[PDB]
Amino acid sequence: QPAHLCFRSFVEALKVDNDLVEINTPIDPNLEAAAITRRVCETNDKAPLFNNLIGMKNGLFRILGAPGSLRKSSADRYGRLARHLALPPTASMREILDKMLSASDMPPIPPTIVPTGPCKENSLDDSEFDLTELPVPLIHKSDGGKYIQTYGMHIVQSPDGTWTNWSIAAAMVHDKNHLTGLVIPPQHIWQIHQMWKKEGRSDVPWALAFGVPPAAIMASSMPIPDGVTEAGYVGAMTGSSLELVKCDTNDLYVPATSEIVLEGTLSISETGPEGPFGEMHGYIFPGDTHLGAKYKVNRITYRNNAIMPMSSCGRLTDETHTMIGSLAAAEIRKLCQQNDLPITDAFAPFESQVTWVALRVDTEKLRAMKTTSEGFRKRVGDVVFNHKAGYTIHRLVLVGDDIDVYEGKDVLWAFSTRCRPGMDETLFEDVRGFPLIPYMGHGNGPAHRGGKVVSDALMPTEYTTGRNWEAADFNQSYPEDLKQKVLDNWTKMGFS
Amino acid sequence: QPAHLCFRSFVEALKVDNDLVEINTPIDPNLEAAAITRRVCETNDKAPLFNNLIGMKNGLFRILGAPGSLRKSSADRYGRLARHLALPPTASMREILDKMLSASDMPPIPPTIVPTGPCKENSLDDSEFDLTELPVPLIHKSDGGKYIQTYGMHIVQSPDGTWTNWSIAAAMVHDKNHLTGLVIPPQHIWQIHQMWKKEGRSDVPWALAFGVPPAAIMASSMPIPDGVTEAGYVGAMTGSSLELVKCDTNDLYVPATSEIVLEGTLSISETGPEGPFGEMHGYIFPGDTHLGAKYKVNRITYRNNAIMPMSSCGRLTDETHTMIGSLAAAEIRKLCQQNDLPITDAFAPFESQVTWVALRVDTEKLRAMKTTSEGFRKRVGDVVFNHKAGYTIHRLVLVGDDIDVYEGKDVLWAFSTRCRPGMDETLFEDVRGFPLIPYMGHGNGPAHRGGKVVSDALMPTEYTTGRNWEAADFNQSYPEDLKQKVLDNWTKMGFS
Ligand SMILES: Cc1cc2c3c(c1C)C(C)(C)C[C@@H](O)N3c1c(nc(O)[nH]c1=O)N2C[C@H](O)[C@H](O)[C@H](O)COP(=O)(O)O
Ligand SMILES: Cc1cc2c3c(c1C)C(C)(C)C[C@@H](O)N3c1c(nc(O)[nH]c1=O)N2C[C@H](O)[C@H](O)[C@H](O)COP(=O)(O)O
Ligand SMILES: [K+]
Ligand SMILES: [K+]
Ligand SMILES: [Mn+2]
Ligand SMILES: [Mn+2]
Secondary structure (H helix, E strand, C coil): CHHHHHHHHHHHHHHHHCCCEECCCCCCECCCHHHHHHHHHCCCCCCECCCCEEEEEEEEEEEEECCCCCCCCCCCHHHHHHHHCCCCCCCCCCHHHHHHHHHHHCCCCCCCCCCCCCCHCCEEECCCCCCCCCCEEEECCCCCCCCCCCEEEEEEEEEECEEEEECCEEEEECCEEEEECCCCCCCHHHHHHHHHHHHCCCCCCEEEEEEHHHHHHHHHCCCCCCCCCCCHHHHHCCCCCCCEEECCCCCCCCEEEEEEEEEEEEEEEEEECCCCCCCCCCCCCCCCCCEEEEEEEEEEEECCCCCCEECCCCCCHHHHHHHHHHHHHHHHHHHHHHHCCCEEEEECCCCCCCCCCEEEHHHHHHHHHCHHHHHHHHHHHHHHCCHHCCCCCCCCEEECCCCCCCCHHHHHHHHHHHCHHHHEEEEEEECCCCCCCHHHHHCCEEEEEEEEEEECCCHHHCCCCCCCCECCCCCCCCCHHHHHHHHHHHHHCCCC | CHHHHHHHHHHHHHHHCEEEEECCCCCCEHHHHHHHHHHHHCCCCCEEEEEECCCCCECCCCEEEEECCCCCCCCCCCCCHHHHCCCCCCCHHHHHHHHHHHHCCCCCCCEECCCHHHHHHHEEEECCCCCCCCCECCCCCCCCCCCCCCEEEEEEEECCCEEEEECCCCCCECCCCEEEEEEECCHHHHHHHHHHHCCCCEEEEEEECCCCHHHHHHEEEECCCCCCCCHHHHHHHHHHCCCEECCCCCCEEEEECCCCCEEEEEEEEEEECCCCCCCCCCCCCCCCEEEEEEEEEEEEEEECCEEEECCCCEEEEEEEEHCCHHHHHCCCHHHHHHHCCCEEEEEHHHHHCEEEEEECCCHHHHHHCCCCCCHHHHHHHHHHHHCHHHCCCEEEEECCCCCCCHHHHHHHHHHHHHCCCCCCCCEECCCCCCCCCCCHHCCCCCCCCCCCCCCEECHHHHHCCCCCCCEECEEEEEEEEHHHHHHHHHHHHHHC
């Protein structure tokens, strides 16, 4: 099976790329595996594969850390991500996001049911497993539980059967046969859970699949539209129907090659303690106490020599930056274009801790609109901040065509030099806010509302007659014939 | 003479450091010298010394570019700057700024008059020079003149004789015996020129000295207080009285070892075209047209084999970032402390194009103040934005003690995650603004007023009971004994 369609094949691909380190000596799931992975993420090192995890019971489990994190070189920086998608390892961010958006103008390709797969190689019933006995990691020293679920896919279906959602949401072990985790608006797991709670008759049939097809985990992390079944979007994106097996204890379908599958229910009534958890913005608030949703596990199925992927999330750079930020930005790009806004590109700068998105504007199109900053900012903010794709994003930065939004230094430059604080900005207080950002949930204002801004880093003539400056830089302040001479004589003269 | 007291000795020091490239083949002052220097600044390369400048007349002149720019290594990043000040080349930014502030609590050491010096080796009178015939650089392709003055020191004295100011302000060649340049509030050259215009009797006696003692050019770039003679501050800072010679045609005093000295007058009446000029924020607006102050040159004196320093300013990183930003930040630190604000450190992040200053707060002291964000922001902004040291700075970012303000990634992290847009900020519209920032002078609002903000990236408990988080990073989310094990086994395991 190809790497984008089978996690096991993805792990080989990383080895083959010289992008893996296999660690075959004993590693402790209490902090050590996550500390090594954290270090990898902070230094853009090779992904760690922990083949010898202290406490591995019943063949459960090895760990792969940093599955979607960065490589050190600029040339293949996003190569781990490209390997999720059958793209060359030198793919740009633009190319990766275009690939993730491509299925939005394609018919879905529904999945294919197969009678078995590797995820059925082993099983443990209700009398045989105990989640507290597995080598579930403690990821951060102050976490309130062992977060088994950082890179698996929750599978839930609407009561009417018409929408099956795949998404990533964190969850931790509660007891031998339950998890807890947050199920919060506007996320699709929450929208579906609300449908089941309004029906009132039963708990939500649920599965959590770990080590799924890489292309599937990418869609799981992207805010594709309400009502759209991820499996058919991934099928369209990859050009092939995904192979799924039925769960044993319910009628959901999981990827055939899933490394580990939990089957059970997500309660419509019960809650239990969750968190705190070290999170994407780089923080943990030890001691925070809160009741989350409760999941019951009835069955585990798994591959021989099963591998659990793990995100050791926090400060730059990990999956919560490379996937959450970038994939939101992609969806925001499309959303703006669909609302007739002249946006060509969008990216969530890592330097903003993926709380900003920079929107590159086609300024020829802007000029033909014959509008002003105050009107354009309001239009863009109304579109994005009232949509689920904007949920995680608190600052939008509008930039003209000279700025590469995929380059954080250029976004910073434009923001700092082209957007007058206050006057060039519109604040949005009556929109949903993201409580996870410390200034929101642990800040001075409402945790769930407001705190958003559109910052216009378009210059005045960009709305009227066109750009009226040149950069004071090597590229723009010197003619081509001189630049080339300089470059051709650089090492001759003594420079590096 | 030591490198910090003699420019010629500074150039040797750079060679000796392996921080110079001597270029002995012909280089064109029309763009080529500045293009090479621009490239150096954008890549943190060695300083270029152009020993063979096309059009060098009467021994005038060689050029040193990038005199105060960065080195490539992290270990001696600020070494060029350290060489201005007798500091080790590994000095930190903190150490450099402390050195620049040290004289603020010392008696001045007045200069010593000597009868001659190297700056008298050669002379050209009013019938012998022509500024349009010298190899003055064109620094950026769209500049409105050849900016002879980018790293010399203007010398002007109050009418009463009691204050002699040394400062850097750009100036360009107007004609064979005049320069033009901006003389604008609140700068000390402008405050002095206003005193002479109010007296109304004569033009301002003036000198411009190029290739001055490095410690002197540093003070020339720092906003030390009104009325304080830079020469006595530099004397105190260095521990020695600076040696000065009298000008021939007026009674001002110039450093004895100056490479090139212009003597003349700054008019109280006449103006002439100036600019446009590629500037510190990374822009030029070609065609901008404006009348600047006019300077008459009556005499040139110079060293044998005179060297003109040149700043090829623009996008990161050059003297306009390393000196203007950092030295303003230093003065702002002191100003805050003198106003009983608990600020321990200040720095202008390069990533903000030195338009922000990050202020590190002693949060134990803050807690004892028993105040709130809204009150503290207003207090800090009132102190800084109503003072000349705040002129160039449009955003202040308050951060707690865990943030290293000299590290732009950490400042960005704190700003993005701890300051709620709008609610955690106070806008200041009734303060002097810096028109040079594009969003000011080429923006949507008043060019000279407003556009400033204090952004509070202190978390709520930092005002009350203390920090209530830990970072989700390698340093803070793992115990010391584990961290050390990881580090000790890193290369063993296969990582880099
Ligand atoms: C890639 C990735 C995504 C997410 C998460 C993680 C990773 C690695 C964790 C490490 C587990 C940290 C966590 O905060 N986390 C997370 C989460 N969304 C949540 O509701 N809850 C979460 O706990 N997303 C984001 C969501 O996956 C996306 O917002 C997606 O759009 C949701 O799908 P849908 O609702 O649009 O179908
Ligand atoms: C280091 C340095 C400082 C300055 C400048 C440059 C360099 C290299 C130029 C390359 C020439 C670019 C230019 O914009 N420039 C510049 C300038 N101040 C001005 O009023 N005008 C200027 O044209 N400063 C800043 C001032 O030197 C400081 O603000 C100083 O504080 C002034 O001294 P004082 O008035 O406080 O005595
Ligand atoms: K999804
Ligand atoms: K000065
Ligand atoms: Mn969905
Ligand atoms: Mn001064």
